[PDB]
Paper text:
Macrodomains are ubiquitous and evolutionarily conserved modules (approx. 130–190 residues) that recognize ADPr derivatives in their free form or linked to proteins, including ADPr, PAR, ADP-ribose-1″phosphate and O-acetyl-ADPr (OAADPr). To expand our knowledge concerning the field of macrodomains, we have characterized Oceanobacillus iheyensis macrodomain (OiMacroD), the first to be described from the order Bacillales. A yield of 40 mg of pure protein per litre of culture after a simple two-step purification process was obtained. Its phylogenetic analysis revealed that, among the six different classes previously described for macrodomains, OiMacroD is included in the MacroD-type clade, together with other previously characterized MacroD-like macrodomains, such as hMacroD1 and hMacroD2.
The structural analysis of G37V, which contains an ADPr molecule bound, revealed a lack of ED for W6 because the substrate-coordinated water molecule is absent, unlike in the OiMacroD-ADPr complex. This absence does not hamper ADPr binding or cause any perturbation in the protein structure. As expected, the valine side chain is located close enough to the water molecule position to disturb its coordination with the ADPr molecule. Interestingly, although the Km remained unaffected, some extra positive ED is seen to surround the pyrophosphate and especially the distal ribose, reflecting some uncertainty in the position of the atoms. As a consequence of the disorder found in the distal ribose of the G37V mutant, both D40 rotamers were present, supporting the role of this residue in the structural organization of the β3–α1 loop. Hence, W6 seems to be important for the substrate to acquire the correct conformation, favouring the proper alignment of the reactive groups and leading to OAADPr deacetylation. In particular, mutant G37V revealed a significant reduction in ADPr release, which supports the role of W6 not just in OAADPr deacetylation, but also in the removal of ADPr from MARylated proteins.
Numbering used by the authors: -1 to 184
Amino acid sequence: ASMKHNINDNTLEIVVGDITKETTNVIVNAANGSLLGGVGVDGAIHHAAGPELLKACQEMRNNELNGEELPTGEVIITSGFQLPSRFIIHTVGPIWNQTPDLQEELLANCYRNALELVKVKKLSSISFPSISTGVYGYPIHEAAAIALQTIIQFLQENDVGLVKVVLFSERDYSIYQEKLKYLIEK
Ligand SMILES: Nc1ncnc2c1ncn2[C@@H]1O[C@H](COP(=O)(O)OP(=O)(O)OC[C@H]2O[C@H](O)[C@H](O)[C@@H]2O)[C@@H](O)[C@H]1O
């Protein structure tokens, strides 16, 4: 299952798939602030990338983040190592309902900051997972709306290239498909 849409010279695609098997130059990891290994998409990414990824992320923690956590909504970039994709942009989504009045803004920041980095570094293509909707508990209907709104607005105003949202389930995909149809019509 897949749906594609042109936004100026950019393309947005939603697809069912495994983000560790993508053809985009960049994939996004829904990471934790400590840049340590976890479960879910982060776990799959570390497994597929191999053990150099954790080592590189810890070097980034200690050398660029002065030994501290990556803040919610912010991004760093590493190699993809054994992944097919060449780079991983790691971001930290909000933990649902910890900070309800800021969480929509912070989730949007994950998308905007990743896309800005792709734009400025001319990285051409990028896949996102469904950030915050696993261990971090964010309802998929609300998250999908924020993700798509943020991505679409960015692609209306900026030259980026190809953006995919890669969903691990038909259910998550079907929710994205409904929202995208609504935003494309509206
Ligand atoms: N291989 C995959 N390809 C594409 N999407 C995937 C894949 N595997 C899972 N997903 C989807 O990816 C989405 C995100 O679910 P979560 O992976 O839990 O991310 P979070 O931001 O909520 O939690 C980050 C925390 O969990 C980690 O331990 C971190 O280390 C942190 O502790 C869901 O739709 C998944 O079904």
